[PDB]
Nucleic acid binder design. Structure first.
Ligand SMILES: [Mg+2]
Ligand SMILES: [Mg+2]
Ligand SMILES: [Mg+2]
Ligand SMILES: [Mg+2]
Ligand SMILES: [Mg+2]
Ligand SMILES: [Mg+2]
Ligand SMILES: [Mg+2]
Ligand SMILES: [Mg+2]
Ligand SMILES: [Mg+2]
Ligand SMILES: [Mg+2]
Ligand SMILES: [Mg+2]
Ligand SMILES: [Mg+2]
Ligand SMILES: [Mg+2]
Ligand SMILES: [Mg+2]
Ligand SMILES: [Mg+2]
Ligand SMILES: [Mg+2]
Ligand SMILES: [Mg+2]
Ligand SMILES: [Mg+2]
Ligand SMILES: [Mg+2]
Ligand SMILES: [Mg+2]
Ligand SMILES: [Mg+2]
Ligand SMILES: [Mg+2]
Ligand SMILES: [Mg+2]
Ligand SMILES: [Mg+2]
Ligand SMILES: [Mg+2]
Ligand SMILES: [Mg+2]
Ligand SMILES: [Mg+2]
Ligand SMILES: [Mg+2]
Ligand SMILES: [Mg+2]
Ligand SMILES: [Mg+2]
Ligand SMILES: [Mg+2]
Ligand SMILES: [Mg+2]
Ligand SMILES: [Mg+2]
Ligand SMILES: [Mg+2]
Ligand SMILES: [Mg+2]
Ligand SMILES: [Mg+2]
Ligand SMILES: [Mg+2]
Ligand SMILES: [Mg+2]
Ligand SMILES: [Mg+2]
Ligand SMILES: [Mg+2]
Ligand SMILES: [Mg+2]
Ligand SMILES: [Mg+2]
Ligand SMILES: [Mg+2]
Ligand SMILES: [Mg+2]
Ligand SMILES: [Mg+2]
Ligand SMILES: [Mg+2]
Ligand SMILES: [Mg+2]
Ligand SMILES: [Mg+2]
Ligand SMILES: [Mg+2]
Ligand SMILES: [Mg+2]
Ligand SMILES: [Mg+2]
Ligand SMILES: [Mg+2]
Lengths: 46, 93, 271
RNA sequence: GCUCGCCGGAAGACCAAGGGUUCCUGUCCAACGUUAAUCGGGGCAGGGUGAGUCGACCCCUAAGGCGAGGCCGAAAGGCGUAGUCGAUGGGAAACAGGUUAAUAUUCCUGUACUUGGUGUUACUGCGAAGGGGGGACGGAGAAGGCUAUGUUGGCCGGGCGACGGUUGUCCCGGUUUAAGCGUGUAGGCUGGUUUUCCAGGCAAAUCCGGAAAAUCAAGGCUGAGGCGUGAUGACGAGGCACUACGGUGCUGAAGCAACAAAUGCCCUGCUUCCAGGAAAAGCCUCUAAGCAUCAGGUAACAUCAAAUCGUACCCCAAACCGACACAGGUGGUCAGGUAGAGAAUACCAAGGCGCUUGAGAGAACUCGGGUGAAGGAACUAGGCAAAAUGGUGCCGUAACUUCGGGAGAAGGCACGCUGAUAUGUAGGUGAGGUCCCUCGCGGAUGGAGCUGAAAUCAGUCGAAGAUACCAGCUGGCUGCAACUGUUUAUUAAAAACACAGCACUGUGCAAACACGAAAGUGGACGUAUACGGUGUGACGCCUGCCCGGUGCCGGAAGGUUAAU
RNA sequence: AGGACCGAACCGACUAAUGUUGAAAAAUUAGCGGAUGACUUGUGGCUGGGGGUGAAAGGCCAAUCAAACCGGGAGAUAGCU
């Protein structure tokens, strides 16, 4: 049956993408946290 | 364009293979690893100057490095440009 | 003309059409159109601000001469057209210096008619001119409300206003509502009734009808649950409320106007 | 390798999305594979993706997003102008064959096309972010002409039969050929050229629009397919040589016609209706600032340019979404033969498969099927489930009705094959020939050939001819809902929601109402024949009495009453 | 002509049996309804948690919803086990 994850790269990079996080205060705040944790993978990319 | 500094840095290696080798008999074409950025233009110039042979046309393609995961951690060989260069008809070196 | 359909199928049997043979066939006049985008009823926050709106047919918007400024220059009605954006029809009108415009089709207008505007124009159906120069008692539509602004009162299929007293520098209009309102006499206005008026005699006849005019269903609060609408839940058909708007304000009665700023201009509320 | 079976509007083939090397070769088998595995989408190493014209980038814009200034907001920030982004839509050009273990409209062979720079030459008013055109638009239905394709015949190559017959009215196979270029067909739309003048097209216009004349009627625009060329070629059974037996090289026949024929194309058409059916650039044209022997503009020829990124492989699935090599889910494209209305269905072709434990037994019981004496709802909460009905044509068909319906009511009869009418009918299709002419893809005449239902009469086989697959059970009384629709994704599809119709009530537009501390926005580019809210639910006949209570509306002299 | 009739695709989900440590965290098989419309479907957009959307079931909002998920207040409080 149709499951909830139907992938789409455009929609991905748009809602959770790097620049989408850079767009807004609280999105940039996310990036900070992930950098504080020292995350290997800030966002998902090419 | 020359940038002979550049012309020297554009060519990296010949690239050996069954395919690369029949491509030299059957179709007077020579097959090289060239810089990632290199243009067909730049590749043409170089091959002319350095390999002193007249150049009919240049084809390029980009090769994706294979990946090789050895337990949890993974690794990736890098991507290179391949150049199928044809050699006019004055076929020498 | 108003046609009944035979019952070859239910939800058709009740259909009453309104078919006007003097209506242009096919596309409108290209250069007077523009985009128009549907809205689902939703404003610039994404929220449905007006319920029940969406789907149904795609619609191009015809620009329509609400102000009627081309004074002096006569024009002829080329043809009458259906406009999907209004209950009225319209006239494609050709001006004597080659300009074309759309106007509200008033009651009798035909192809090959002269209309005209300006303070002088003949008091005849189609002619626009300031009200100071219109005979008190005339029935008039597409009435300006401020001088120069453009048509606001009596625009809908089969409607009209009647000047019932000049005096002052204002007129006093009997609006179709029944209300009697003052408005300055330099407000332009058009002689006639606005056109087609068999309009109200349609019956739709089936559900999809209203659907393709962009009207989605209305849910009776009494069929909702109390968390949704003040008209509760029941337990098999209960009411027991004093009937209200979904936001807990009273229908069936409560006056909701409030302006003061424009209070001056109203001489009799409707009834 | 020979056989057997299965799918074949798919279980075949190609995309998109998504995966990210799974593709090909060598090699290995621990672990992974529900078994063994020498095999693998497993391990390891190597190889593999070639573009001016396929796609993306690019130009253009939709919804929507961002948004110098700005408007608003305790701060954060919200809205928004010019602008700037955003395909799911618009915008230049390439095809057939060949080839690799693995790419190919990308490499090769053959044959093309696009649009820019340069140059030469001849000829000319050129010139935007502007104007105009154009791009540019819905649904339904109708039928004609085509093609893709197929059948038969002819033609060519090959065949003479494991068992009675098979040199013929016999058998088998093939009979294929692109873009491009030329011709302007079936057919669609529209009358043309000239001159003059003008309150319109933010300035200007030779353009569009408008007004006048004059004049010739044939003028232009669009346009499937056919034919011709492309093709001296490609492809083509099969031969002949070589062969590591995998293959490779060489060579190479016929390559037509008739008929049938889409859902593809003419068709962005035609007709028609109501719900009245994107934008912008490219493109054509018009001029403004301008530049005027310049630059430009059009054309021929030559010449250079056309970068960068993607291209392997899976694709309705073992490679994607489902924890799995999971009976599930996933958009688009292609449509062969016989029977058939058919994209159903049964059997086949091309192609793909037999589903990654098997070997035997022939107990109970369970799952899934077949048949069943006599009885036939006696079962059971209930005919649950079974069994039954099932096509086409003609005949025939009740109450009742809103005159459409009820209706496929019901219920009958016919049905295969062979012969005859007619060695193949009616119909369709249409060549030679004859004549005509604005001679063309033309018209009239002509009926050869081809194809071809149906009917009656007669005969005949079986138990049975709609013989399989396929494919309504029918009727009577009554509750509820008018009806099609909607709903509890996953125990409720209903009498529940909706609905057309009716009523009440708000609303004069800076509308009421709604999202918003606000700016701003929906309602609406609407304007009371409109918009909101509430209840009722087609339609027929109707809808009585009560205002004390509680809500609401109006009112006001008094009384009571806040800050102050 | 028609929210017209019959019937595949496509959309649905009326009945039964099977399955119930399933082939499957809702399906298989036989029957079933709609199938030119209030039809169906791809791609992108918009609405955000006392909020959305709802032909109204308290349905749906990532295997869930009479107030989503994540992190924080946080060692909430637990006269209860
Ligand atoms: Mg490339
Ligand atoms: Mg209602
Ligand atoms: Mg209603
Ligand atoms: Mg309820
Ligand atoms: Mg409440
Ligand atoms: Mg009750
Ligand atoms: Mg085998
Ligand atoms: Mg791997
Ligand atoms: Mg094993
Ligand atoms: Mg493999
Ligand atoms: Mg492997
Ligand atoms: Mg090339
Ligand atoms: Mg700013
Ligand atoms: Mg903004
Ligand atoms: Mg852009
Ligand atoms: Mg695109
Ligand atoms: Mg391949
Ligand atoms: Mg030039
Ligand atoms: Mg333009
Ligand atoms: Mg053909
Ligand atoms: Mg024999
Ligand atoms: Mg491929
Ligand atoms: Mg498949
Ligand atoms: Mg398996
Ligand atoms: Mg599977
Ligand atoms: Mg089938
Ligand atoms: Mg097996
Ligand atoms: Mg039986
Ligand atoms: Mg029996
Ligand atoms: Mg019996
Ligand atoms: Mg009996
Ligand atoms: Mg009993
Ligand atoms: Mg009994
Ligand atoms: Mg039953
Ligand atoms: Mg049965
Ligand atoms: Mg009863
Ligand atoms: Mg019902
Ligand atoms: Mg129904
Ligand atoms: Mg349920
Ligand atoms: Mg209303
Ligand atoms: Mg009711
Ligand atoms: Mg009453
Ligand atoms: Mg129907
Ligand atoms: Mg049906
Ligand atoms: Mg159910
Ligand atoms: Mg089923
Ligand atoms: Mg979506
Ligand atoms: Mg859920
Ligand atoms: Mg709560
Ligand atoms: Mg929490
Ligand atoms: Mg605390
Ligand atoms: Mg605790």
């Amino acid at each position: 049956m149709k499951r909830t994850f139907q992938p789409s790269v455009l929609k991905r990079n748009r809602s959770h993408g790097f620049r989408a996080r850079m767009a807004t205060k609280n999105g940039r705040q996310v990036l900070a946290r992930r950098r504080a944790k020292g995350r290997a993978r800030l966002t998902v990319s090419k | 364009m020359i940038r002979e500094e550049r012309l020297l840095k554009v060519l990296r290696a010949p690239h050996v293979s069954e395919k690369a080798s029949t491509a030299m008999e059957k179709s007077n074409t020579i097959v090289l690893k060239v810089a990632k950025d290199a243009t067909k233009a730049e590749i043409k110039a170089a091959v002319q100057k350095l390999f002193e042979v007249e150049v009919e046309v240049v084809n390029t393609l980009v090769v994706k490095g294979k990946v090789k995961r050895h337990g949890q951690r993974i690794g990736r060989r890098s991507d290179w440009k391949k150049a199928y260069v044809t050699l006019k008809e004055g076929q020498n070196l | 003309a108003v046609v009944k359909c035979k019952p070859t199928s239910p939800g058709r049997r009740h259909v009453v059409k309104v078919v006007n043979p003097e209506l242009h066939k096919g596309k409108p006049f290209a250069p007077l159109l523009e985009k128009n985008s549907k809205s689902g009823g939703r404003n610039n926050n994404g929220r449905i601000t007006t319920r029940h709106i969406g789907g149904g047919h795609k619609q191009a918007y015809r620009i329509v001469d609400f102000k009627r400024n081309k004074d002096g220059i006569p024009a002829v009605v080329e043809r009458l057209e259906y406009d999907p954006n209004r209950s009225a029809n319209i006239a494609l009108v050709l001006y004597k210096d080659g300009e074309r415009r759309y106007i509200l089709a008033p009651k009798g207008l035909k192809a090959g008619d002269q209309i005209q505007s300006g303070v002088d124009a003949a008091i005849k159906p189609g002619n626009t001119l300031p009200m100071r120069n219109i005979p008190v008692g005339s029935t008039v539509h597409n009435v300006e409300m401020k001088p120069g602004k453009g048509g606001q009162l009596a625009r809908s299929a089969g409607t009209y206003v009647q000047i019932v007293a000049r005096d002052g520098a204002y007129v006093t209009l009997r609006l179709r509502s029944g209300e009697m309102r003052k408005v300055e006499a330099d407000c332009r206005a058009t002689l006639g009734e606005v056109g087609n008026a068999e309009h109200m005699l349609r019956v739709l006849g089936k559900a999809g009808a209203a659907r393709w005019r962009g009207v989605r269903p209305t849910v009776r609060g009494t069929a909702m649950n109390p968390v949704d609408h003040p008209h509760g839940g029941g337990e098999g058909r209960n009411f027991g409320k004093h009937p209200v708007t979904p936001w807990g304000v009273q229908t069936k009665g409560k006056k909701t106007r409030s302006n003061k700023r424009t209070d001056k201009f109203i001489v009799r509320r409707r009834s």
